[model samples]
Target: GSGNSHTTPWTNPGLAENFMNSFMQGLSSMPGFTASQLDDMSTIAQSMVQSIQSLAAQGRTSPNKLQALNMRFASSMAEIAASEEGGGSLSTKTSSIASAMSNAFLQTTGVVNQPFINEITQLVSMFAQAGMNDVSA
Candidate 1:
């Protein structure tokens, strides 16, 4: 373990969301991440900030709520970023965070803003091709 490793785990969506929010906060404080990513991330952060505010106002913070909030925020952020990068040319399928995350490497490589849609399209094609194998009787 000589090498420095500081990877955050995403076991629970609740904790993962909290970490994401905190990481963004740190990034915002330092302004160190890629400016494009930072800009998009900051907008996503504000949405979470609002959710946090609403929960705090009610003096309640259920773990379940946190998980759902994080999921929605992540999905929305992914969808938004993908669409922005594509210049509103992406399809509805790309509007999912899962798709975006699956293809994040391609999208944010200074190539395009919207990569989620493309990922989803390819995923669907792969699945369609796989189903043709007909393993099930």
Candidate 2:
């Protein structure tokens, strides 16, 4: 219900596909991730992209809810990594997953302003920190 112009990146319906395509290409950097697991990550990425589109369509923004979306994805990622026969510790995989996903999003969204990049950064940090915490705890 706020009046301030809250423009977001998902307005371009194509951006979702763009993010997915980039994510698929970018996953090559990750070790111990199978093609099967890539499919799973693709599924999760598409899911989150659709959710972002849903909220963007409503022209509403809730910082907390947005972070929740990111956190939810984080949980699933940790779940996937935890269950996978991984060669690395949770901390490293966590960073790899978090960075790759966020970078794909950023790459497609074409974030320019310092503030725009920070907005993207701030949310995914929850996603990143959420998974890494699972490692030590």
lDDT of 2: 0.58
92-112 in candidate 1: lDDT tens per residue? 322333333333322223122
lDDT of 2 by residue, 47-89 (tens): 8777777776776546765656544655555555654545445
Which residue pairs collide, candidate 2?
none
Clashing pairs in 1: 82-114, 85-113, 85-114, 94-117
Question: TM-scores across all candidates?
Answer: 0.37, 0.59
| Root mean square deviation (Cα) for candidate 1 | 12.4
Task: After the best TM-score superposition of candidate 2, give how far the Cα of residue 2 lies from its true spot, in angstroms.
Answer: 26
Residue 128, candidate 1: Cα error in Å is 19
